[PDB]
Structure formats: C-alpha cells, structure tokens
C-alpha cells in the first residue's frame, strides 16, 4: 500500500495507454514485464481501484485480468489531466 | 527469367489425421497443376505423447491408472522448385487444425 507515487503514476499511465492490464499471480517477483515496477505493487493498485469500482477483475489461472469501466476511465483522465478523445480501447485507433 | 531450384520442405503436423490427409492431398493436387518435380507426402513415425496418471485425485481407492495419449502426425512434402512458386502455393493451402510450415532451402 505504501507506493512510491511515481511508480503508481507510471502504472496508471500504462493502464490508460492500454485499456487493459494483465498481472501475474506472482508476489515475490522482482519486476513486472513492460513497467519497471514490482508486480505486487501493481496488483495492490489494481485491487485498490477495484474496491472503489472502476476496474473489472479476473483471477483466472495465476493471471489477474483488468478492464476499465467508464467511471474508471474518467477517474484515470482526472488523474492524468488528459481531456477528451483519448486512447484506452473503447474505440479503434483507425482501421484495425 | 529467374527459375533457380532451391528444394523446399513442407512440414505438416497435427492431431486430427483426416484433416491432415486432406491438406496433403490438396497440396499434391496443387503441385500437379503447377507441374513440378516433387517427393511425396513422406510420413514419419507418428509420435504418441503419453501421460500416465493415477485416476484418483487423492490416492484413496484402487490403483487405477490412465494413459492420456496425444497422437501426432508429422509429414514432409519435398519440392524441387524455386521460392516464388512455393509462395504462390502457400497463398491458400491452409485448413483449420493442421499446421502448415515451410522449411525452405535444401
């Protein structure tokens, strides 16, 4: 729960970029893939997010799955300052 | 202008044998229509993958054992051909379940 806030911010940014986050059920792991943060920290953050709505969670097969709801998206926007017409995965980037 | 013979191996691996056979047949037909020198749908020792297990979740009954086996079918299709023709062939020639793989070069 005691998160060096920069790391948390980075995690949030990553989430916003993606629209989706996949976490290992691996505590004791030194560093998560992609983000230069500890898996555990990420998991904690996502748990926190879930506990106040925002994110839908799955524990399936030693893998946590994280999809962001509309309220969640709004909250993320508020956190990051980015205004409107932005990434996640609510709509396609172009023709893909 | 080109036509430089490379000799190309095609791998055909899968489980559902019928599908594999069909694919092989299709490939041979295609080869015939493009008219090439080719070695046939060479078959390898169809590898069984055995996993034998206590049927009991917990080791309290009679000692029932099950061999869960995976039949695998490995096929080599050798072509005396350039690469362009192979590419043309592999534009289609894909059917669900079966693995199409091009080794390329002799």
């Amino acid at each position: 729960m005691l998160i060096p806030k920069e790391d948390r911010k980075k995690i949030y940014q990553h989430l916003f970029q993606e629209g989706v986050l996949v976490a290992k059920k691996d505590f004791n792991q030194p560093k998560h893939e992609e983000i230069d943060t500890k898996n555990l920290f990420v998991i904690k953050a996502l748990q926190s997010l879930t506990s106040k709505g925002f994110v839908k969670t799955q524990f399936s097969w030693q893998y946590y799955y994280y999809t962001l709801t509309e309220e969640g998206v709004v909250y993320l926007r508020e956190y990051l300052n980015l205004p409107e017409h932005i990434f996640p995965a609510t709509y396609l980037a172009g023709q893909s | 202008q080109e036509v430089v013979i490379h000799k190309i191996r095609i791998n055909l691996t899968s489980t559902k044998v019928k599908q594999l056979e069909n694919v092989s047949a299709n490939i041979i037909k295609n080869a015939e229509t493009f008219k090439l020198v080719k070695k046939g749908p060479v078959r390898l020792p169809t590898k069984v993958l055995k996993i034998s297990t206590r049927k009991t979740p917990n080791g309290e009954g009679s000692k029932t054992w099950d061999t869960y086996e995976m039949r695998i079918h490995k096929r080599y299709i050798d072509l005396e051909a350039p690469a362009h023709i192979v590419k043309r062939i592999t534009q289609i020639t894909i059917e669900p379940g079966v693995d199409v793989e091009v080794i390329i070069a002799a």
Binding site: - | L49, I51, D66, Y68, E69, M70
Partner: protein
Amino acid sequence: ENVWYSHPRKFGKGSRQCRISGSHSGLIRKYGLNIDRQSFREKANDIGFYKYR
C-alpha cells in the same frame, strides 16, 4: 520492500508452480505442461489428450 524476502529458489518443488492452482503437488512437468495432475485429468480433452489404450 524488505531486503531479505527470498530464498535461493532456483529449483525444487518451490519454484515449480502449476499453471492453474500453483501447486507444488504432483506436477506433470513433462512436455513443458506444468500442471498438477488432477486438473489435467479434467482439462486433458481440450489439451488434445485422449485415452484409447
């Protein structure tokens, strides 16, 4: 965040985790499956495994 929170767990039944439950109990490492056998004996049909003989 503590400095000493890991044993040298390179091998043994510790490092070897299952793909479903994460068990250290009866782990079919064979073929690079890494499953606790019980679960496999339920999912095997989808894993392409069948019993014939």
